[model samples]
Target chain A: SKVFTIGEILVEIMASKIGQPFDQPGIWNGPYPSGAPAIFIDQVTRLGVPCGIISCVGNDGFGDINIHRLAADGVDIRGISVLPLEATGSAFVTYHNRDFIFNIKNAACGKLSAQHVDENILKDCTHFHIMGSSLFSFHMVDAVKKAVTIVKANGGVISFDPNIRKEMLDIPEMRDALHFVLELTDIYMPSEGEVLLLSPHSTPERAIAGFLEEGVKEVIVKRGNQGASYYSANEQFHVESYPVEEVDPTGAGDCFGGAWIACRQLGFDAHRALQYANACGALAVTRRGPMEGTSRLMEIETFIQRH
Target chain B: LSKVFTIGEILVEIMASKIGQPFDQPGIWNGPYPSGAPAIFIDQVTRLGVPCGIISCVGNDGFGDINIHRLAADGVDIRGISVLPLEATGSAFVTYHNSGDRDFIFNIKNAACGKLSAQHVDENILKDCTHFHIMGSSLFSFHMVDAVKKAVTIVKANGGVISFDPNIRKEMLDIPEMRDALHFVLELTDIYMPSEGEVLLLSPHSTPERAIAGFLEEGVKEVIVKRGNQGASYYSANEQFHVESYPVEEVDPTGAGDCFGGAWIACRQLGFDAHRALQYANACGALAVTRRGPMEGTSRLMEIETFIQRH
Candidate 1:
């Protein structure tokens, strides 16, 4: 059973120095292959879960780096379409201040429609993951809806990560798409704020209980350094975070979701998956560049022993 | 095999929407239009059904896509253009004044195109090129200068010809290497194209007549003086002629000279005389200003003929 995901594929270009704003021009240092779903899939395959990504990129250099890196790690890339007329998505980020000036909503990957999602790629799907940032366009929302249906038909599990990006928050359709995916999600992972925002009850206990009551098998709440908590109908546990030096927090959550999903695919218990995922998140921020910190099973195993 | 080739920057131009708009603060801007001196020139060459190539680099972003799609659609040989990974394509912020003078803030020396080096050009791409055109503004970086130098060596060794145009602003003249590099190419020029005032500025003799005589005496095959609205003058040791430019509404004056040079090169390559080539060149310059963007005004051979016929 392979893990399959569909979303944006982008190249992140960050400010070379800190404290720069989008109002003026400055030097930037990337075109690094990125996108929440792209990072999630990269980390999943690195953990030996043979995953696939269904996304779109421009037929340009930015597209080349992402596809090359993903396929090198053995990702199923047949679903990623490269368009000739559109440009690959890009984010011009400020390094320290962390202001993102991105071009995903209207970039080439933004052209991804429902028709591009092929059933052939989903034939072996056992688990499908969704990134909330990918719902910026209604076209992609339709694509995700179709894929979720086919995955459910195969009796595959569905996971959702509400990795909200501020740039895409203003689109009203995206908010509705979030609630729609939340219903299909068997594994719902949300940040502290995200969990509260989506729940009818305000408290974390009420929200997690409400989600578990709503038919979700597991509710994983991600906290950056304090660690992540997992809840099931039978039990609730907190996986204390490993105290490692933090460099950049860009792709840590993607790694966390990837680890948890891979461990679950391997038939690990909920408690063991949360521990491995917490270790993976702590290890991820110790390195710079988004996908650069993707760890294999051996790396995660070794990191788990240290703390 | 290509008939014409050029080496320089490939950038997207962001133009101020209204006249008298300055870029000091935020203002409304119109375009990310396909631009760059050599890009405009080579694009025009292909629109005339002439095979051509370029030696340049652009960031693999939206701006780069805009330029690459335009050049490739116009039938240019794109092998020599490098898509620099993670780098941003160069940009030019432009504004027009009430006096009809244009101002540009060029961000090239440190952008993706500024990384151009001799590695971007090779004998394989230049092996069959019959002519090479050089733009003076492209000498912004030493790496690009070296790249052009390498291309000149290959084409010159193949018995091909060279055309040099000193299409640079006076502000760019402040660079010490500009004069040195201009003289280096001037000595090797077969056909020299210069603006009317540049004839006096670039010449050692200090007068328009003496400058033309000086260049002709140095075995330069031809010297063409481009006058913005007054038309053009062609001087050669064997023949001399003048062509008056057409009266057209000027929406944007940029790229007219590059288009003129492209059309002149096309006509001469087809064995047209100096007078006929000058007329075609004038027609090209006239039609170029009618469009808003630099490369947007490129005319196909039929359009050029139709425009000339209508006038």
Candidate 2:
């Protein structure tokens, strides 16, 4: 395995002008082209690190825009394929205060068969990023498990971001799908609340211990504003986020993971890598919209050094 | 002073569908909505929450029922409408490709309201009004043209402003009565708003200077040359000014100009001067095209007020 790869549920969200609280009628703004894995990829590109993304999107306007924007942002889009006759994956995004929530319907991204994952992709990847959303889809879950299995068997590392948005996991087969990926994941990255979901009564330290006990070599739990905590080998420590007035906190966590992955790929060590990643995520919240906040990488670094 | 009441034909328009494989597939392709210029104007003015009434006729059919229901839901007063028995409602069928342009197939003739004459209109309704907003589509036929003219004359004598939109189709202007109808309507109009396509055809002197002169000679108190998605060219009081259109992601542009006219007249009535009214009208039109349906785009005056302040 040589090239780094990330995978997840790719979705197109049809959003209204209103930011959050779904019941209120908002004008049909646009199909906000989004997916957790791609958001991570966008952050990686902004950090000046090149990476590959492997996933299947629907062959619709939503999927086209998602793929186009991702390629435009400089991610290696060779592995991404468009499934025919499907109305691309979509999420209805709503923003309430600082958090962005959604009611997502898996359209075509779920139909990514195991055959779609070529052996060439597995053999050419070093770090494999597995996400939580696609696990809800059995076909995609099976494909990801196979991909991780192939990556680990070839002696490559895996950075796992268990992006636990509840609406994605409310479906059947979600628990079994998640357990399968955990065994192969070398680095575990879950958000602060995701830790609570995984271990309701335990603290962040306990959550990391539990994840590490599952044969994960490294664990990094992202805590918004308070920064992220990383546990690897015998070392465990937290990184503080730069303070910024957040306008839209939609993609901050994914932004953090992306920056972290990109920095790590560039050989940035534990403490320095966490700081850079936290800075990137914190800066994402200060913008009017998502994706455009990818501009805050260097600014986040400056904010971190000064703080 | 009594509120203005307008009488004319209403249409349910289907401007093609986006689905199916190029109209060649067995499946039905529909735009999921109907669109007509007059219906759009009435919708906007009604949504302005103004005191207005329309004296129109429709067939006692599904299309007619839905048209009346749509207008009424948007708060338009449809008290003067007479639904005819047996006849089907008027409609326009259009086909468009992906880039927002289109070709039309209209069924304006033999429809219920197309046969409406001066007898169907009540003179008392015109007598008790402060404005007369007329569209050229009704004037396409002689019976409706005479009926509309009779209403305009009454509104003029009673001291109501007459706003005229010469909604023209270039290929059809060569028809004898169509040219004459444009000439006749201009003579009675206080405000003349012609789209870019119509302005070029109706005033065929070519240059803007000569066309403006010809339109003014027709006795229209003010002439406005409308450029869709490109604002307007306003000529009034021996002077002319150019207003640029604000860029917007227009989903369906069918009823945009009509929305602009309704907002313009409503703002003027609220004591906004021509320039200010045009600005407000421009904002209303900009917002109108962003939404999917006609009335959906007409935001509250407060929304326009906020947009203006920011601009």
Query: What DockQ does each prediction reach against the true complex?
Result: 0.02, 0.01
Score each candidate by Cα lDDT. 0.83, 0.68
**Predicted structure with the largest DockQ when compared to the true one:** 1
A1-307: candidate 2 lDDT, tens digit per residue: 2344545434323233444332222322334456777787777876777667777765554566667777887777877877664445544344443322222233456567677787686666777787675565667776787777888887888777777658655555776577667767788788877875554346866666777776888888788877778887689888666678977676777788888888887789988888888888887778644465775456766877788
lDDT of 1 by residue, A212-251 (tens): 8988989999988778998888888897778888877899
Cα displacement (angstroms), candidate 1, residue B108, comes to 17
Task: Give the runs in model 2 whose Cα sits over 4 Å from its true position.
Answer: A1-32, A94-106, A167-172, A199-203, A295-297, B1-311
Error of 2 at A108 (Å): 2.7
User: What is candidate 2's lDDT per residue for B93-174, written digit by digit as tens?
Assistant: 3456666566543445455667677777776655567988888766667887888877887778878889888876664477
**Candidate 1, true inter-chain contacts retained:** 0.00
Q: CAPRI verdict on model 1?
A: incorrect
Badly placed stretches (over 4 Å) of model 1 are A20-27, A166-171, B1-311
